[PDB]
RNA sequence: AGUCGUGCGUCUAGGAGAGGGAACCCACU
């Protein structure tokens, strides 16, 4: 659903920067590479985290409910 | 449906002491410590501290099962040299060098603007 | 030198679950196939509702 | 003590009565949440 | 039960999780891979099988 | 992780590895055995039970 | 003298040092305290009023339990297992109330930020979420349609990563020595060249490259441990390695303390 | 460059438990 609060590798806090990064992709046209480095993520962990990412709360949200 | 209890791994348990010193008959002058709710974090560095000791000879950290948070500390030293001496100097050693290690990062800390 | 066909993609061939499959080639079709009955027991989002 | 799938109205009806929404036809009659106070660990 | 060597006596350790744990090498009789594979324990209820599982 | 076991991180199962939710969904009727019978959904009182 | 700390660079969550003069077995304890021994507050209870979005309580509240607070004054702070209160009471936990509901056509994203304190902290700079990103609108919690209504309340307590990761005051310890292979403790995997296979580490630069003339040094000890300290925020990566130090010493001390007692 | 039209609402505190066969299909070691 939503993007998980920390890496489960190392724990880091990844939350805070996918509205950030979906910023980056659109607003910049930036490569995943290049916004993810950017943001600060270092260790593939994250990035993994990060890009492998689905928003599915927005699918869901769609529902009336 | 019956995970062991997280808490339970650092907390002792009720009618627990921390530590158990019984003899060892294997060799004279062995001791056998059993620390409870612990982890490879403390036997480990007592270990290192008690073999850079000239006069302690053995000492060897087991940990017996992942699930249970206790390991055995066998130590044995030279004729004359009670066991739980030797651990309490180690102790006191590494009370000192970290104590010193601390003081020596907030100093570089204080020096570095950052 | 006739090949009056061809094929679109190779890997078309692949079903469903042995196409979630990476590299099949490079596993042994046993493998493959254990993947591809496995992968009917994975738990994950089956629909959006 | 319930509530609509679509009109999602609270309908607080009895026994011996009608299990349709009042506002629309569908008759999902869904139910609220327990008002007995639930906690959660993130454990 | 393929061969006589699929049901043996062993002692009881008690353990807090919900998954039987033994020795590796009883694996090899067993023909257990810990992918999944399912066993059963069977307490003895009486001295006499108890004595029988232990010496047999 | 011997015979094809796996070792896996306590702190990541913790922190939202691999994570599940279970929906189980129960179904009653009040099927009619004789006309004018019927059940009722009422919790029992445990008179004349 | 003893050991010594060169700070090679230093960050708001993030610092590489150099310890020198310390046992592989000292490092290695002091990593493992800092990582799962430092106190941290945490969310630890949330308490349901009205809650009706698309995602599950459990799934919310563990959400919440994995969002960083500020920590600081936690040695102020006792565990409520500690002290004698009812439940917790302010003095060993700190009360946040989360409310919020969606509108005509907007979604309603939830932050870290919304969580508002509650309980007394008495003059105490503990439990106030941590905000990092340039945005500053915090770790996204959920996303909340018109009509669905989050209304709930978050006890945090006192504890250590050891009884969940949430506490967890640093994401990545990365901890190296003898980047040159001087006490041969790796045997590098190589097919055609060790060297060429294997790139240089960034630390090797720091230590001067072997020479093949000299033999292999038997009495050579491990030294030189380049240690990087990353801090998820809660607490800095300063004082995360000062606690982490301490509790290690009162560890230490505990453990004198029970032997002289028995 | 020195001034100006427009809007709001009227009543609220009392002790205890016991039970489905067959057939079909999916799936695990
Ligand atoms: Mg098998
Ligand atoms: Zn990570
Ligand atoms: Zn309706
Ligand atoms: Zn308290």
Same mark, same amino acid.
């Given at each position: 659903?939503?993007?998980?609060?920390?890496?489960?590798?190392?724990?880091?806090?990844?939350?805070?920067?996918?509205?950030?990064?979906?910023?980056?992709?659109?607003?910049?046209?930036?490569?995943?590479?290049?916004?993810?480095?950017?943001?600060?993520?270092?260790?593939?962990?994250?990035?993994?985290?990060?890009?492998?990412?689905?928003?599915?709360?927005?699918?869901?949200?769609?529902?009336?409910? | 449906?019956?995970?062991?209890?997280?808490?339970?791994?650092?907390?002792?348990?009720?009618?627990?002491?921390?530590?158990?010193?019984?003899?060892?008959?294997?060799?004279?002058?062995?001791?056998?410590?059993?620390?409870?709710?612990?982890?490879?974090?403390?036997?480990?560095?007592?270990?290192?501290?008690?073999?850079?000791?000239?006069?302690?000879?053995?000492?060897?950290?087991?940990?017996?099962?992942?699930?249970?948070?206790?390991?055995?500390?066998?130590?044995?030293?030279?004729?004359?040299?009670?066991?739980?001496?030797?651990?309490?100097?180690?102790?006191?050693?590494?009370?000192?060098?970290?104590?010193?290690?601390?003081?020596?990062?907030?100093?570089?800390?204080?020096?570095?603007?950052? | 030198?006739?090949?009056?066909?061809?094929?679109?993609?190779?890997?078309?061939?692949?079903? &469903?679950?042995?196409?979630?499959?990476?590299?099949?080639?490079?596993?042994?079709?046993?493998?493959?196939?254990?993947?591809?009955?496995?992968?009917?027991?994975?738990?994950? &989002?089956?629909?959006?509702? | 003590?319930?509530?609509?799938?679509?009109?999602?109205?609270?309908?607080?009806?009895?026994?011996?009565?009608?299990?349709?929404?009042?506002?629309?036809?569908?008759?999902?009659?869904?139910?609220?949440?327990?008002?007995?106070?639930?906690?959660?660990?993130?454990? | 039960?393929?061969?006589?060597?699929?049901?043996?006596?062993?002692?009881?350790?008690?353990?807090?999780?919900?998954?039987?744990?033994?020795?590796?090498?009883?694996?090899?009789?067993?023909?257990?891979?810990?992918?999944?594979?399912?066993?059963?324990?069977?307490?003895?209820?009486?001295?006499?099988?108890?004595?029988?599982?232990?010496?047999? | 992780?011997?015979?094809? /076991?796996?070792?896996?991180?306590? /702190?990541?199962?913790?922190?939202?590895?691999?994570? /599940?939710?279970?929906?189980?969904?129960?179904?009653?009727?009040?099927?009619?055995?004789?006309?004018?019978?019927?059940?009722?959904?009422?919790?029992?009182?445990?008179?004349?039970? | 003298?003893?050991?010594?700390?060169?700070?090679?660079?230093?960050?708001?969550? @993030?610092?590489?040092?150099?310890?020198?003069?310390?046992?592989?077995?000292?490092?290695?304890?002091?990593?493992?305290?800092?990582?799962?021994?430092?106190?941290?507050?945490?969310?630890? %209870?949330?308490?349901?009023?009205?809650?009706?979005?698309?995602?599950?309580?459990?799934?919310?509240?563990?959400?919440?339990?994995?969002?960083?607070?500020?920590?600081? #004054?936690?040695?102020?702070?006792?565990?409520?297992?500690?002290?004698?209160?009812?439940?917790?009471?302010? +003095?060993?936990?700190?009360?946040?109330?989360?409310?919020?509901?969606?509108? %005509?056509?907007?979604?309603?994203?939830?932050?870290?930020?919304?969580?508002?304190?509650?309980?007394?902290?008495?003059? $105490?700079?503990?439990?106030?979420?941590?905000?990092? #990103?340039?945005?500053?609108?915090?770790?996204?919690?959920? +996303?909340? $349609?018109?009509?669905?209504?989050?209304?709930?309340?978050?006890?945090?307590? +006192?504890?250590?990563?050891?009884?969940?990761?949430? !506490?967890?005051?640093?994401?990545?310890?990365?901890?190296?020595? #003898?980047? !040159?292979?001087?006490?041969?403790?790796?045997?590098? !995997?190589?097919?055609?060249?060790?060297?060429?296979?294997?790139?240089?580490?960034?630390?090797?630069?720091?230590?001067?490259?072997? @020479?093949?003339? #000299?033999?292999?040094?038997?009495?050579?000890?491990?030294?030189?441990?380049?240690?990087?300290?990353?801090?998820?925020? %809660?607490?800095?990566?300063?004082?995360?390695?000062?606690?982490?130090?301490?509790?290690?010493?009162? +560890?230490?001390?505990?453990?004198?303390?029970?032997?002289?007692?028995?």
């Amino acid at each position: 659903m939503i993007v998980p609060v920390r890496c489960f590798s190392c724990g880091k806090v990844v939350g805070d920067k996918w509205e950030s990064y979906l910023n980056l992709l659109q607003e910049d046209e930036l490569d995943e590479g290049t916004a993810l480095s950017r943001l600060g993520l270092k260790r593939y962990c994250c990035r993994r985290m990060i890009l492998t990412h689905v928003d599915l709360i927005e699918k869901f949200l769609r529902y009336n409910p | 449906m019956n995970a062991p209890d997280r808490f339970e791994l650092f907390l002792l348990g009720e009618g627990e002491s921390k530590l158990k010193i019984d003899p060892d008959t294997k060799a004279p002058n062995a001791v056998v410590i059993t620390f409870e709710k612990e982890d490879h974090t403390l036997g480990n560095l007592i270990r290192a501290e008690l073999l850079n000791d000239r006069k302690v000879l053995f000492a060897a950290y087991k940990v017996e099962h992942p699930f249970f948070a206790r390991f055995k500390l066998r130590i044995q030293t030279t004729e004359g040299y009670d066991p739980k001496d030797a651990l309490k100097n180690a102790c006191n050693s590494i009370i000192n060098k970290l104590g010193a290690l601390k003081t020596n990062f907030e100093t570089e800390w204080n020096l570095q603007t950052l | 030198t006739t090949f009056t066909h061809c094929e679109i993609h190779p890997s078309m061939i692949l079903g &469903v679950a042995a196409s979630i499959i990476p590299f099949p080639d490079h596993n042994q079709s046993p493998r493959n196939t254990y993947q591809s009955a496995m992968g009917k027991q994975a738990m994950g &989002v089956f629909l959006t509702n | 003590k319930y509530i609509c799938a679509e009109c999602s109205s609270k309908l607080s009806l009895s026994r011996t009565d009608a299990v349709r929404c009042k506002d629309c036809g569908h008759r999902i009659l869904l139910k609220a949440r327990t008002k007995r106070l639930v906690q959660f660990e993130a454990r | 039960s393929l061969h006589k060597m699929s049901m043996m006596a062993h002692r009881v350790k008690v353990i807090p999780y919900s998954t039987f744990r033994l020795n590796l090498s009883v694996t090899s009789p067993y023909n257990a891979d810990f992918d999944g594979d399912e066993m059963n324990l069977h307490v003895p209820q009486s001295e006499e099988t108890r004595a029988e599982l232990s010496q047999l | 992780n011997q015979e094809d /076991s796996m070792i896996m991180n306590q /702190s990541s199962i913790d922190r939202g590895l691999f994570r /599940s939710l279970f929906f189980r969904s129960y179904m009653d009727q009040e099927k009619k055995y004789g006309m004018s019978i019927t059940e009722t959904f009422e919790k029992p009182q445990r008179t004349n039970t | 003298e003893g050991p010594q700390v060169k700070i090679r660079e230093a960050s708001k969550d @993030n610092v590489d040092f150099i310890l020198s003069n310390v046992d592989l077995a000292m490092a290695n304890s002091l990593r493992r305290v800092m990582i799962a021994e430092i106190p941290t507050l945490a969310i630890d %209870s949330v308490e349901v009023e009205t809650n009706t979005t698309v995602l599950a309580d459990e799934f919310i509240a563990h959400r919440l339990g994995l969002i960083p607070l500020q920590s600081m #004054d936690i040695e102020q702070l006792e565990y409520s297992r500690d002290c004698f209160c009812e439940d917790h009471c302010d +003095k060993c936990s700190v009360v946040l109330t989360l409310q919020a509901f969606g509108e %005509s056509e907007s979604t309603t994203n939830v932050y870290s930020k919304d969580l508002v304190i509650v309980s007394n902290l008495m003059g $105490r700079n503990i439990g106030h979420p941590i905000i990092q #990103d340039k945005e500053g609108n915090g770790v996204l919690i959920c +996303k909340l $349609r018109k009509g669905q209504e989050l209304k709930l309340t978050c006890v945090a307590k +006192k504890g250590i990563a050891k009884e969940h990761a949430k !506490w967890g005051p640093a994401a990545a310890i990365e901890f190296e020595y #003898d980047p !040159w292979n001087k006490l041969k403790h790796t045997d590098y !995997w190589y097919e055609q060249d060790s060297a060429k296979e294997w790139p240089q580490s960034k630390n090797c630069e720091y230590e001067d490259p072997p @020479n093949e003339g #000299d033999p292999f040094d038997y009495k050579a000890q491990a030294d030189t441990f380049y240690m990087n300290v990353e801090s998820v925020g %809660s607490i800095p990566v300063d004082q995360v390695v000062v606690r982490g130090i301490d509790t290690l010493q009162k +560890k230490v001390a505990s453990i004198l303390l029970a032997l002289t007692q028995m």
